[PDB]
């Protein structure tokens, strides 16, 4: 059962908007919105969205496997060995948020302070004492971005697994000699760093010059979750405020995806006339170039929605009905919608490019969609006995074993949010920058128009 199976199962349900049903529905962990900082929904005047893995939730593991296959094909096309074609995407290996160390070719799971929680070289998991040879303080400086790449996004899940596949392959292939920082093949030396660069280049190519989008839009039922409650929630948001889209994708792809997301024989509710997806938005902006978008951005352009090309020139006019923007900056949104940052709830899936940056640079309110939570919540509740035992032991060898047993329930790289009793960097960033979070933003449907999301005030140790 993948997290997208859970999402699609809930997506298939019709909305029962009886007040008592909603209040009961939201109490269930899977339909709940979780709260890091208090947020009064009545103060929100604009609801903003990205598209990928928020509105358009790509099905798992089908989409990751497609991106993996095309990335492998691209690497082989540029001269990587044929054996790469025998790889096959394995969703049980990668957890999101791992750090690839380009010096030693390791995938690392770290806490918020750069402490090592898991270390794998290829598919070999390196235990604590053996990591000290390469990591004498069991620690990395995360912000050394020349050395470390943090595989933060759901789009990074295939390349997370591919990196481990490649290290595994070159390590065990007799044509190559394993060295500390790469692989030697006679008069050729491939460092883990140049390997990583090829992989990054190939992933980028697949998404922006290859056939990934084309293969996606030709079989949208295979690749994209569809939920009839999406138009209902957006229509209700538009009754009490403004709704905008700000996506890094271009207009042609956005139009294809959004048209599918709204392709029902009805509008917001069953029995209502169907409405075009654009009608649900007060402002539509593509080619956003987040996170640069939240600083100086790029020049504001207008999409010719007939041809899908940009009109020539910087757009200097006002917000018009039916206009579609390209580029610009977050100030564009604020000026055109007459909003200040704390009036905006921005709903995204990119912990860095959507949530961290809109919070820190603009003071927007933030809703982080975490698709894997749809399944991790089930593992967390089903295996709570493991965690509680671990808590009790905390109050050594038994600790490591329960930690391992708990973690393996999530996959070979453990929970997105912890390893045993130790929280991941990703978990710490969710708590710090996401005001609200959930497996899907659809869970906002089950809360009244002026709900007060509440979180406990924080006290320092000397204040307790």
CB 200 within 8 A of CB 160: no
Q: Quick one: which of 324, 242, 244 has its CA closest to 286? A: 324
Nearest to 257 by CA among 443, 63, 74, 91: 63
Contact status: 408 vs its own copies (CB under 8 A): no
Q: Which stretch binds its own copies (CB under 8 A): 235-243, 269-277, 280-288, 427-435?
A: 427-435
Q: Is there binding between residue 455 and its own copies (CB under 8 A)?
A: yes
- Contacting range for its own copies; rule: CB under 8 A; set: 56-64, 76-84, 94-102, 152-160: 76-84
CB of 272 to its own copies, least distance (A): 34
Using rule CB under 8 A, residue 208 touches its own copies? no
Which residues have CB under 8 Å from 142's CB, separation 6+?
99, 110, 114, 148, 150, 425
Per-residue 3-state assignment (H helix, E strand, C coil) for 394-462: HCCHHHHHHHHHHHHCCCCCCCCCEECCEECHHHHHHHHHCCEEECCHHHHHHCCCCCEECCCCCCCHH
For residue 171, state whether it binds its own copies (rule: CB under 8 A).
no
CA 110 to chain centre: 18
> CA 135 to CA 130: how far, in whole Å?
9
Q: How far apart are the C-alpha atoms of 281 and 134, rounded to whole Å?
A: 51
* Residue 40 makes contact with its own copies by CB under 8 A: no
Closest by alpha carbon to 164, among 70, 71, 87, 62? 87
The only residue of 19, 20, 79, 397 in contact with its own copies, by rule CB under 8 A: 79
Closest distance of CB 314 from its own copies, Å: 5
Of the candidates 47, 49, 53, 80, which one interacts with its own copies according to CB under 8 A?
80
Min separation Cβ 411 and its own copies, Å: 18
427 part of the interface to its own copies, by CB under 8 A: yes
Query: Interaction with its own copies in 47-66: which residues (CB under 8 A)?
Result: none
Q: Is 340 in the site for its own copies (CB under 8 A)?
A: yes
The stretch near its own copies (CB under 8 A) out of 62-70, 83-91, 214-222, 310-318 is: 310-318
Does 302 sit near its own copies (CB under 8 A)? yes
Enumerate residues 6+ apart whose C-beta is below 8 A from 230: 55, 261, 262, 442
Q: Which stretch binds its own copies (CB under 8 A): 61-69, 87-95, 210-218, 426-434?
A: 426-434
For residues 142-161, which are near its own copies according to CB under 8 A?
143
CA dist., res. 319 & res. 282, Å (int): 9
Site residues (vs its own copies, CB under 8 A): 29, 32, 34-36, 78-81, 113-115, 136-139, 141, 143, 183, 185-191, 194, 198, 299, 302, 304, 307, 309-317, 340-342, 359-363, 373, 377, 380, 391, 394, 417, 421, 423, 427, 430-431, 437, 455, 457-458, 460-463
């Amino acid at each position: 059962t993948s997290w997208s199976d859970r999402l699609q199962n809930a997506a298939d349900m019709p909305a029962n908007m009886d007040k008592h049903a909603l209040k009961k529905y939201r109490r269930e962990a899977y339909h709940r919105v979780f709260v890091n900082r208090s947020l009064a929904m009545e103060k929100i005047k604009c609801f903003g969205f990205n598209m990928d893995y928020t509105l358009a939730v790509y099905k798992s593991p089908e989409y990751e496997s497609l991106g993996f296959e095309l990335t492998v094909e691209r690497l082989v096309s540029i001269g990587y060995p044929q054996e790469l074609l025998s790889f096959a995407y394995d969703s049980t290996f990668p957890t999101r948020g791992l750090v690839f160390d380009t010096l030693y070719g390791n995938l690392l799971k770290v806490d918020a302070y750069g402490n090592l929680l898991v270390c794998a070289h290829g598919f070999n998991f390196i235990r604590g004492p053996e990591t000290r040879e390469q990591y004498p303080n069991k620690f990395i400086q995360r912000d050394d971005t020349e050395r470390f790449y943090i595989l933060n996004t759901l789009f990074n899940l295939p390349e997370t697994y591919l990196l481990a596949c490649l290290v595994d392959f070159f390590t065990n292939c007799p044509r190559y000699t394993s060295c500390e920082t790469g692989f030697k093949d006679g008069d050729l030396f491939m460092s883990y760093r140049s390997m990583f660069q090829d992989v990054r280049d190939a992933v980028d190519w697949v998404h922006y010059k290859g056939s990934l989008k084309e293969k996606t839009v030709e079989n949208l039922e295979k690749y994209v979750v569809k939920d009839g409650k999406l138009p209902l929630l957006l229509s209700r948001m538009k009754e009490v405020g403004k709704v905008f889209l700000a996506t890094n994708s271009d207009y042609k792809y956005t139009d294809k995806i959004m048209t599918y997301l709204f392709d029902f024989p009805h509008g917001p509710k069953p029995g209502s006339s169907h409405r075009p997806w654009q009608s649900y938005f007060d402002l539509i902006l593509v080619d956003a170039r987040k996170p640069l978008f939240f600083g100086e951005g790029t020049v504001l352009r207008q999409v010719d929605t007939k041809t899908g090309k940009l009109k020539i020139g910087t757009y200097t006019g006002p917000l018009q009905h039916g206009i579609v923007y390209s580029g610009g900056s977050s100030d564009t949104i604020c000026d055109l919608l007459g909003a200040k940052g704390k009036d905006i709830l921005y709903i995204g899936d990119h912990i860095f490019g959507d949530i961290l940056k809109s919070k820190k640079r603009q003071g927007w309110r933030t809703f982080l969609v975490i698709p894997e939570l749809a399944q991790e919540l089930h593992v967390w509740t089903d295996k709570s006995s493991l965690f509680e035992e671990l808590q009790s032991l905390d109050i050594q060898r038994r600790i490591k074993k329960v930690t391992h047993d708990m973690d393996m329930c999530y996959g070979m790289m453990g929970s997105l949010f912890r390893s045993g009793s130790r929280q991941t960097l990703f978990a710490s960033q969710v708590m710090r920058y996401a005001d609200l979070y959930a497996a899907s933003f659809i869970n906002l449907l089950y809360y009244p128009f002026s709900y007060l999301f509440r979180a406990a005030h924080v006290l320092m140790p000397h204040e307790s």
